[PDB]
Design a protein around this ligand. Sequence first.
Ligand SMILES: CCCCCCCCCCCCO[C@@H]1O[C@H](CO)[C@@H](O[C@H]2O[C@H](CO)[C@@H](O)[C@H](O)[C@H]2O)[C@H](O)[C@H]1O
Ligand SMILES: CCCCCCCCCCCCO[C@@H]1O[C@H](CO)[C@@H](O[C@H]2O[C@H](CO)[C@@H](O)[C@H](O)[C@H]2O)[C@H](O)[C@H]1O
Lengths: 168, 459, 99, 53, 177, 606, 63
Amino acid sequence: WDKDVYPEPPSRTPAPSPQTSLPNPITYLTKAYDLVVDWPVTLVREFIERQHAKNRTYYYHRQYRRVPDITECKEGDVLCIYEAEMQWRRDFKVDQEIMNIIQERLKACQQREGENYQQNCAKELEQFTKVTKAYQDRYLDLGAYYSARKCLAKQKQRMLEERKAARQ
Amino acid sequence: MLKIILPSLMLLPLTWLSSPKKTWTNVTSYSFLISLTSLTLLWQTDENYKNFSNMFSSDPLSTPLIILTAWLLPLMLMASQNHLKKDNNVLQKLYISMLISLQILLIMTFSATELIMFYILFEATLIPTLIIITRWGNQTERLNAGIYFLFYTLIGSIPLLIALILIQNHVGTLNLMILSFTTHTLDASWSNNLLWLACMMAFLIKMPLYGVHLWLPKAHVEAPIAGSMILAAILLKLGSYGMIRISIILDPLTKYMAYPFILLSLWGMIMTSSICLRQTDLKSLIAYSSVSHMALVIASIMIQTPWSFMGATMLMIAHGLTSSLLFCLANSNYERIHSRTMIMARGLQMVFPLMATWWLMASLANLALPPSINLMGELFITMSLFSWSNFTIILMGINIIITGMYSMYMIITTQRGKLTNHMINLQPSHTRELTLMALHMIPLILLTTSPKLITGLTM
Amino acid sequence: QWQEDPEPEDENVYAKNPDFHGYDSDPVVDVWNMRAVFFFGFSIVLVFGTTFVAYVPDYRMQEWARREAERLVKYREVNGLPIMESNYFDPSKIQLPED
Amino acid sequence: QLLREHWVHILVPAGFVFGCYLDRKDDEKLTAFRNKSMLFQRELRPNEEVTWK
Amino acid sequence: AFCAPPAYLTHQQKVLRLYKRALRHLESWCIHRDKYRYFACLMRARFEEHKNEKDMMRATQLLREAEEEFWQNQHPQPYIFPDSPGGTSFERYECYKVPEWCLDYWHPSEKAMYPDYFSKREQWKKLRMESWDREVKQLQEETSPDGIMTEALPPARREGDLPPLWWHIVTRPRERP
Amino acid sequence: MNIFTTSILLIFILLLSPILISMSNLIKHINFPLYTTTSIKFSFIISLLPLLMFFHNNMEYMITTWHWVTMNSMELKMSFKTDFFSILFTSVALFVTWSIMQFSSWYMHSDPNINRFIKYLTLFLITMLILTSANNMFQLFIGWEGVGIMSFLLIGWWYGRTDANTAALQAILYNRIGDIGFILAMVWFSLNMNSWELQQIMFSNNNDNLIPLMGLLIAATGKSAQFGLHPWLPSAMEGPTPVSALLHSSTMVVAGIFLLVRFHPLTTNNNFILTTMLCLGALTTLFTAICALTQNDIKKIIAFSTSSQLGLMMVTLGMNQPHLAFLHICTHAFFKAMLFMCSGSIIHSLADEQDIRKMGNITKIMPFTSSCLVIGSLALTGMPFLTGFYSKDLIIEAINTCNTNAWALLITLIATSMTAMYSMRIIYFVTMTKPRFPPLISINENDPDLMNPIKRLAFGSIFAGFVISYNIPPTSIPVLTMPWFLKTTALIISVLGFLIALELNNLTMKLSMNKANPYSSFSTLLGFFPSIIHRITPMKSLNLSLKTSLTLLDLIWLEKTIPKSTSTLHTNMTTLTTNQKGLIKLYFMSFLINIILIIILYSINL
Amino acid sequence: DARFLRLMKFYLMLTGIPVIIGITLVNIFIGEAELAEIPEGYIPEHWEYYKHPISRWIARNFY
Ligand SMILES: CCCCCCCCCCCCO[C@@H]1O[C@H](CO)[C@@H](O[C@H]2O[C@H](CO)[C@@H](O)[C@H](O)[C@H]2O)[C@H](O)[C@H]1O
Ligand SMILES: CCCCCCCCCCCCO[C@@H]1O[C@H](CO)[C@@H](O[C@H]2O[C@H](CO)[C@@H](O)[C@H](O)[C@H]2O)[C@H](O)[C@H]1O
């Protein structure tokens, strides 16, 4: 849980503020649950975590050095085009995961706000809208055979259109 | 890939050098182990597709099909173990050799890197399948069925040869990676349209389009169980795989050259699904169900969206497994009552209670039960086509209704109802048949657990 | 009529060897074949195959994709950049055709 | 001896062994670019010979 | 169900069937027992009012009129006996009426659980084996010389002989298994 | 919070326990029906706790268990949405299923495969709970379609009955025609919002949401048996009485109303949808109450009562009253299940008789069953302060004092009175008149496995309405100011209907012949919808499939056009060429023509 | 039918139960690796990018 990438507003639970002579069943059920279930389970988990502390091992997130883009490839030079295309595919799916993370933020915001979502989730709705516009302008209408070259052609079509609009 | 091909070849020496007693057991066991070995192609922890040499490669699209092919051979041997009960040893070994050769050729085809590999290894499948249909078939018209099956495909294929030669002359090569990474836009000349057709027609025939689907209802009701299984589990998917691999070059012509075949698929699906309602041959009913499903696959592939490709692949695998299971079940009842009519045998749930369970599960896979990968595929193809045009939902819904309808019709007609008590010969289900059905179902359930394996290249 | 054998009479395979597993006439070959099928299929391919497929890691490097996306999002959020720019290819690189 | 017919069991595993060996040979022939690719090119670590052999 | 239908029906059979059907529909209309009796007596009065009509043409015309009136006045939803065709639980137990020829496939270990029943069954099979030849000859010899046939089968005439074609009549599953 | 989520998951685990035990050899050695009853009891007890938590702090949870798959920017997670609807309905469904699962042991002691029957009932319960506690539209579909399959298997449990087989296929027909709309909703909400999760879908309130909500309305129509696709439910009583009691009344059939309640936020704006639902509910209520009258089967009358109640819920949703519609769902679950159980008791005690003409004087002979049946009827026609009244009365109040289609309002009120009329039909012809059953009385309801479940459901019908109504949090502002006639309209119409029914029924003892009547026939034959649709549509469709498709085109014209035309032409050409008379004179004449032709070609081409 | 079910369960369990036992023991004792930043000046081995001990063992010994 990286709170940054997965923002989570603070908790604001209120006071017990009881006004009834009767006993709330929930507190006693929760005490029984705690003692009976949570405690042994926590013991087991602590034992596993000690066993993990023993025999600790490490794994590293892979780093992929950048390589020339398809823009730097001479037509029909399959050798460089392959590397450019693979780089583009990796960037494509990293963008996919960006979209997943932002959509998860939006869903969590909706659930958290509840019936205030029509106002308090405006920030995340705005972020979602901007990122989906970016995603549409990057990868949409590209066939199932999407490729760096198709993306480049689409971008250049849009840039030609924008240049025309600016001229006019 | 050569750690999977060579054991398959060596199965043949084992088949022919084994003693008559142990031949079936040895070949079945070693074929299962070859299937296990084939799982090595799922260690793709990166986006770089596997290329084992200049000749053989694998992809997210080819690995599931290759693994399915490996899986089918043991089941084909089990299904054939019975109807070959009283044939001479050499004839039995010939059958086993034919199946082994079919597996070898199909794996090589799916793992081929050059389309003129593919065009040879794809048509080489005709010989073993033709022999299986014509030699070991039962009824007299098996000869006619073999002729249809051979020549539909050959007429389709020859234009594919011409188009491929033109492609090689124009480009300089036929390695699919090179074609992908150096493709260029076609122009809407009449010659280019004729090409598009020449490239696409052989595969469309193998994916029987509504107008050229007459060779399945014949080949299936004339072919033995193993022939039907391999055919409408792998052979039918040769067309889809070829279409997927080859459509990369044929752009942007597809935008308007797909209207005819999309329309034919989306209409023939309804027509064939309806035909399933009023057909008196169980084998034929299953064959026409297969035709409808392949109609969906063709529509999705010819619209080419990411959803289309991924759902088409998922449904390719799902149909493979499900149709195979259905044919094994129907052959189970056929081995006893020696008839193919659906009406004749009824109420068999009163005597084969467990095989009734397998029947029910197969019918659910057919009718597309959520969360089954069958549904997932059909749902995603439906989403793609709805995006393509929001009116296709009408045809899709009519087909869904009719699909459910014939799927349950099979069950009610056969499993349920008064037992045809006059059938004395109905014998308790063989452990062979039950294990065959289990081996068909369990992979389906596990893949429904883990769909990520069977998605296509796109997703 | 031509000289041809009569059609063989039907058989019940449970008349002999009431423990017919469906694989062979001889009981010994039949049972050993059934054991081979169950063992090499279920007790090997399905079990070991399923475990191997389950423990294939980072399939199509999806987990790597998610991890790198999280890293990039944190970087961009800290540095104030837009999460994704509408232009994948930096326009300065592209020599857009001049008129 | 029962090897008379149990020798036959060595064919398929021999098939697998031979296939693996041939795969290694296939990868031998394709050695160029062993460590000459933009993404993955690196200086060999001390006490090393081949990157992926 | 235990007797084959005739080639046709006479006026007597047709009128009796109409009487029964009309009485049952009258009951379905008149739920209460007293009302049903009140109207059924009138129905018998009507039916017997024309009991002795020796002009069969007028008799048939009367019967046709009665039938048309019946079709006009039939209860839309009549009373159906639970097991009667078209009534709830008509075939509710046909799932469990599994035949007897299945027992032949039982595993010997399953037959061990029931030793005596299968010994008696073996006696029965022996009896059927013995009686088949005689009963087939009996039917062949009792076939009518003329070309006029009826579904009804012959009885056992000789001594110590089972009735012709009796295996399927006997041994049929119990109604409620 | 741990306790709440843990309990939610433990409910499903407990419900799966009987299934896994079934797939083992311990099923033979244990008393499986009692084991499953116990599991259901414990699951209900567990569910009570989350219900208390919600009633306290009203906190709703999205719980994501497993990540099934990721589809290029559309994750599919096994999600759970626990809130008012899901929690309360899980509690109610578990209660009613506990009662019906205990009662199934009594009603099905004799039948073999009782273990399979119990397994199927359990499976249905799991599937319906999946439906209710579902966030993904895909998971909701899993529930939607799995309950359909279980209904198919339970209807026509006695697969001997050709009629029951037809009934199961009828249900599949109508349900699938419904599910077309559901799939349309899925695809639209996937393309336009790129997510099947309800939380993300919520942000489509500012779009049009007509194409998807029409799919939802159609799916709800099909599943809840609204007028258009109504025939399936009434004729779904071919199955065992416990199945009818549970599935096709208390729990399953509420699926459409539940789906619409879940998607209430989107349908608030789309007036077209709301008016459509108002009209559909009104039409179904009136139609199925008409059919309910003049029906002589104890189970079919209750089936049509259920359809009428569901039509009323459709009206409840047609006006923006989702919470109240769901309240009606839960409240009616109790007494509808109780009425079905009482009818099952009667049917079993008598020789499997289901006609209300051969039942009479039951009040004297079976005091317990008749008492609980009277309670059930008085709950169905909400008498003050029973379970029904704590929902139906408020529904009618809102109906009479909200802007509404005048005709819809009128027929709804008439159907409300007519419910009293047919409930009187039952209470009279089955409990008040002198006996009509076969002479050999053999009546025993003293079995605890029958008495106790019905006792529990009667206590439910008597208290749960008040308890739930007083405990549920505020949701919709109710209209409490109104004229005297509007305020007591429901009571006056219901009582007037009761009196009219009493007069009409008492008129039957008059020694005069009831004659066939157009309206009587229209009511009894179910409006002729079965007789007409089920005889025209299947015939036309099937005849087309055989003739136009299989025969005219596939078996004839395609063969002639593609294969046989080629075969012919080639045979014609071979018979044209090969047959040569075999004479050297003619052959060399042809060679001469070749000579000349080559010369000419050379000359002209130069 | 009973025999088929019994044999299938036996032969599936024969290796399922030992394998699940192995998985549970590995998870409980060996444990899963944890993410770390590459120590600058180090060339991680190909397997060392995979979280699970079984996955990394297979990687090292066979890929
Ligand atoms: C778009 C290109 C793809 C389409 C290609 C189509 C090519 C298909 C060629 C199939 C040829 C099969 O040729 C088949 O020969 C058999 C001989 O047994 C004929 O068989 C039939 O012939 C005649 C009917 O005309 C009968 O008298 C005879 O008894 C019957 O067997 C079939 O009618 C014919 O179809
Ligand atoms: C573009 C080129 C495509 C070539 C691919 C198609 C190959 C075509 C194969 C043509 C030969 C098929 O051969 C087919 O033989 C059958 C009998 O066997 C003939 O059918 C024959 O049947 C019987 C006699 O057997 C007669 O009653 C009938 O009138 C006669 O036609 C078909 O008319 C012929 O077409």
